[PDB]
Amino acid sequence: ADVKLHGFWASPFSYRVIWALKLKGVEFEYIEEDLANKSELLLKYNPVYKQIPVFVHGGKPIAESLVILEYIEETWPENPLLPTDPYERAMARFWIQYGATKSAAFGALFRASGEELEKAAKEVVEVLRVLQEQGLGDKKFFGGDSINLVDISYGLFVYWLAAIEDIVGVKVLEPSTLPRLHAWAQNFIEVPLIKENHPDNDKLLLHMKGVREKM
Amino acid sequence: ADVKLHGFWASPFSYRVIWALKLKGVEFEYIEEDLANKSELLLKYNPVYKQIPVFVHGGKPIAESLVILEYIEETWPENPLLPTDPYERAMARFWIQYGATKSAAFGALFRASGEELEKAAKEVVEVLRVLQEQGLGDKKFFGGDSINLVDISYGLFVYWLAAIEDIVGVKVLEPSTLPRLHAWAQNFIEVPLIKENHPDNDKLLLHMKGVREKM
């Protein structure tokens, strides 16, 4: 059954799926979607959200990156991206859900006014501290010695932190404040799979700087 | 390994876990938590959210009802509450996630002012229409001929609809507007497992009416 991925060049959600497929060694056709003029296939495949990514396997579509990632893990179980033990799997799902819930704080910091900025940055630092202390601990990656679906889901945090630093100017992931999480972020971007698969940084900063003009 | 459940008498989230355990035939000790004075075990077991439910198995805790439900399904796989096929499992997770995301609209309607009420009720009806058309379809339950984790996760919607109708007075799940979803709601409350396990309706309406005094 052939695999298609409808994505967007600057989307971290589309990149989550690219990472999981490339890790599994699953060949796929990538389809770049124009978000200003959504394709007939995108609207047919994702009527509920009308968003990318849309993963298609054997002509059958799946929307929502977290749902797609679990389908990929179940369909191509070799090179596992989740643990086999139910309790460890529940801890992985717990941290993936925590990230999804707290993702709103990153967008809030990105659009915060000159005054709102201090409180927004404070809330992001506390989210990162809990993630570091209770989620990562002393492990190299959320997945232990190699990346797993938890690391993949936290690519979105790295994407936001780098955009807030380069465009806004506030630093929320500092080595002296969060040494373990900062070491994790550096180690994650150095994983060859990640290094080989990410938006062009200059093009991404420019696009995101322009998107921030919503104020 | 013994099973404990830290819950709250009026919590639909605690009831999701009770339903799944009773369906699986798993014996458990139930611990009623005083939300005004959280127990030492609750704060130790759920430091991230400090919320019930907290499920404990072999002394190991799990927080977040959706995470707990998947652990129960994986640990006691007999009497399955999720399909075995990855694509059907992905559709179940998709609809469970849709419910979690849209749950905020129900709280919004519950606390809406006399003016906000019309727009809040409109947004809830559209959430229910998409759930009915694209999620339930012509099936008796989200799980087909019997309830599954999707039906269990949508107990929360039934809890809200009955509270909005009895206290506020607005009807958002009408038989002539949503015939299939209304038939589903009636069929769900008639399932003996559900009928035997829910908060005392009079006590629940009174508690919720008092909680609505946050305006």
Author numbering:
A (entry chain A), B (entry chain A): 2 to 216
Question: From the publication, what sentences describe this entry?
Answer:
Glutathione transferases (GSTs) constitute a widespread superfamily of enzymes notably involved in xenobiotic detoxification and/or in specialized metabolism. PtGSTU19 and 20, two paralogs sharing more than 91% sequence identity (95% of sequence similarity), would have diverged from a common ancestor of P. trichocarpa and P. yatungensis species. These enzymes display the distinctive glutathione (GSH)-conjugation and peroxidase activities against model substrates. PtGSTU19 and U20 have the same secondary structures as the known GSTU structures and show the canonical cytosolic GST fold.
Nearly two-thirds of the helix α6 of U19APO (residues Val159 to Gly170) were refined in two conformations. The first conformation corresponds to the one found in U20APO/GSH/GS-PAP with Trp161 buried (ASA of 10 Å2) and a deep H-site. In addition, the side chain of Tyr160 points in the direction of the assumed catalytic serine residue (Ser12). To our knowledge, this is the first time that this helix is observed in two conformations in the apo form and in one conformation in the GSH-bound form. Two-thirds of the α6 helix is flexible in PtGSTU19 while only one conformation is observed in PtGSTU20. The disorder of this α6 helix could explain why it was not possible to obtain crystallographic structures of PtGSTU19 in complex with flavonoids.
